[PDB]
Amino acid sequence: MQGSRKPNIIFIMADDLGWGELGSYGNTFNETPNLDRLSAQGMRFTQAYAAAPVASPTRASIMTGQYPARVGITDFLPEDEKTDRWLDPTKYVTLNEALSASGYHTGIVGKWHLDTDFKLNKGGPKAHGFNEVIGTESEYIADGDYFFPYSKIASFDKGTANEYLTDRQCAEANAFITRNREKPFFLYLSLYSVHTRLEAPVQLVEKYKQKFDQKYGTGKAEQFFGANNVRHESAQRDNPWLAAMLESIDTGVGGIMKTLRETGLAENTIIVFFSDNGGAGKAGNNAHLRAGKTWLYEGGIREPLIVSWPGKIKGNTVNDNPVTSLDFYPTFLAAAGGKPTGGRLDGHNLMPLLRGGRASGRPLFWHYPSETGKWVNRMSSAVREGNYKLLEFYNNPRLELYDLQNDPSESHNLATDRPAETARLKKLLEDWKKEVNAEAPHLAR
Amino acid sequence: MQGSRKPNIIFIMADDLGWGELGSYGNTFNETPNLDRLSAQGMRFTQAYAAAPVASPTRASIMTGQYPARVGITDFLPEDEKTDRWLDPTKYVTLNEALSASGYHTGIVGKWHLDTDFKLNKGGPKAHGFNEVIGTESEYIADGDYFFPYSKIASFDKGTANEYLTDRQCAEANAFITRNREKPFFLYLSLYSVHTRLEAPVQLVEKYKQKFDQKYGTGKAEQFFGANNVRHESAQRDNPWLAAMLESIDTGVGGIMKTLRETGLAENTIIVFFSDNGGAGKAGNNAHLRAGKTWLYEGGIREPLIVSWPGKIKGNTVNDNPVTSLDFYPTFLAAAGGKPTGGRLDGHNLMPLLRGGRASGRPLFWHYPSETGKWVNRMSSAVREGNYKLLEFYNNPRLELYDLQNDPSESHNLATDRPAETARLKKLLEDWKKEVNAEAPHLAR
Ligand SMILES: [Ca+2]
Ligand SMILES: [Ca+2]
Ligand SMILES: [Cl-]
Ligand SMILES: [Cl-]
Ligand code: NA
Ligand code: NA
Ligand code: NA
Ligand code: NA
Ligand code: NA
Ligand code: NA
């Protein structure tokens, strides 16, 4: 039946995918032709942030629209016996429920990581009200399992011989789109890829190993990524396993884009591609950015962000205004014609910015006390306002100030040379840490 | 040269050895004939405690004579990047320095676990003043390496093909005894065994596998401890790998006892055998005691304790008075004719008790906030006074009270039925936690 309907929202999030990985973000080794077509059909953000530098807190920021420091989940949820933390459906109106109240059918395909108690699982996605819960984790994901039968995903009881998980999750996405084509839907495609341990179909791995040898020389893939390298990790850039994993994601994104075109949903569907945190050490490519996952340096929090809404968002646009994972909740509620129902939202609606509007500066905040990883040298808090970023570190206590426009690699600390700017941002950070009751870092006495 | 000399002190400590493992503690599967001879030549303690339920804090209690909660090391030291904690030689007069000031030459053979920074290692045993430092760890021990070349022990640069670590450490003990026979010595024999991952010489493993099949039936060692069981762990009691590991320790203890007899040092040497914490889950045997390593239940803190001093300590005695790892510092200083030099000691000299004296009751305390393991259900504090033990748990907050004489397995909580005793011990525990500035547990908000 033809007639206007609220737009579908498809939120595709990769796990641990670095800012330097996509073709449109400058990578020449990986191949991401479908995501580069999505970029050509939409708006590419160069200064998009996860609200945390590890998995669970960024997922919490997306589902609650609140600072991870305010939620009290600032680090990943470990196995059940190592935490008492979980996201409680009675404490938050989650993004899926806000969209349900605005007329949407909701689904999650994949990773939740907001509850690691599987005995009761009172904070799993079904408990949060998702209408469809497809291949979510049934035990602690840990280093993962990417081939059927999926040891961490009991609910995928059926599958083909040696099926690859990214391919399964993308097929489930297309099927969800087809089953729900007559009504507004929200689909959270929460990929397990590219989380370690790296694993990809053999023929994709051999493709990128041959490409690596063409780039670096004969026998070099075997030299750096042979039998003896069990995790397929190294300090070497261009990771054939990551490239293979990313090709599977990219092909799956192409299948979703094709499904939208075939079902005649492409004109009335918003497609977002994002990542939950920065590239992982020894696996991921954060380009010139400093460090990666576990750090509040730019490499750990800067993420790929493509938003497409054909005919509403100008294609092949590049937006450098800073945005974060907190902004999806209000943006999607605006697209859905909904309004907050008393719940606090810590981000901002980007629909006016996506439509070509102007961006007012606002401060952005992070807090990483590393409650789970215990990474004492990474424990830090940060504020960005305009081009300046201030980090406070707790072990070796000190402030670091970067001008990210002139120093995007955070190689030249300005805190001593710009003491007034340092103090101005320090005051914003101190005030914010009070507002959110920021958890103290786990250090000695 | 003949003439009286202060007694030698040999402190032999197994890693993660359970109360239920030794022959003299009732085990009929393992074979510990040399340690059972040591028991027949000395005093066996049935109610001996580690001051903590994991490695580093108990080692801190021994070297400083202070409560782990007062030191601020109540959980194991993880890898360097996960901690800022270490034992500082400028904060404590350690037991080796107190004995050096009383005329002893000192040595450590083996595990330290009081500093995991190997870049500088300002808290390693050499920095603490040990005269000889033999085969201590040069990197984070983690799941260990028991065959030469020892991946965690660079300083054992020389060794025989496939040498086993327990055999090396016991040979180094005998050689240390022989080299220093003319003067008083303190030897800290800090074994890496029986820490997981379990590993023992093949012919010892096959001996205990055949013994397991005789006990349990044909093919049962292969059934429970075959190729498919990589860590050699199970819920099954009688672990052939643990039995093999313990035979190597026992044979080594016999070699030390023989070396003392041959060098004519046996009459003037105090030999202690102890363990740093309770048996490990799926590996160790804590007999009827509750739980094990990581818990403040009796299985995690009750340890084997044999003390021999021929002609001073009556042989084949059994002492049921409670004693802890805090008591070694004052006991050894009394044996050495030394006196504390301003340093606080939290235990008590047992020399009068070892000589046949009477034991006054005193309260004993534990604090386990699990700063490193993050084991939320194990987080607890405890006080024992007389036969009563009170535990306070922080997750699922509650008090548990046990009468350990009538309920040594801690199977019948009395806290509701004996409210006045519960309150009396609760007050001692609250006062103690204040005295030592007990670290709060790592829980949610
Ligand atoms: Ca992640
Ligand atoms: Ca231990
Ligand atoms: Cl537990
Ligand atoms: Cl680090
Ligand atoms: Na839990
Ligand atoms: Na809710
Ligand atoms: Na599998
Ligand atoms: Na460290
Ligand atoms: Na000292
Ligand atoms: Na080795």
Numbering used by the authors:
A (entry chain A), B (entry chain A): 1 to 445
Sentences from the paper on this structure:
We expressed and characterized a putative sulfatase (PyuS) from the bacterium Pedobacter yulinensis. PyuS contains the (C/S)XPXR sulfatase motif, where the Cys or Ser is post-translationally converted into a formylglycine residue (FGly). The enzyme has sulfatase activity on aromatic sulfated substrates as well as phosphatase activity on some aromatic phosphates; however, PyuS did not have detectable activity on 17α-estradiol sulfate, cortisol 21-sulfate, or boldenone sulfate. The PyuS protein chain has an α/β sandwich fold comprised of 15 α-helices and 13 β-strands that form two anti-parallel β-sheets.
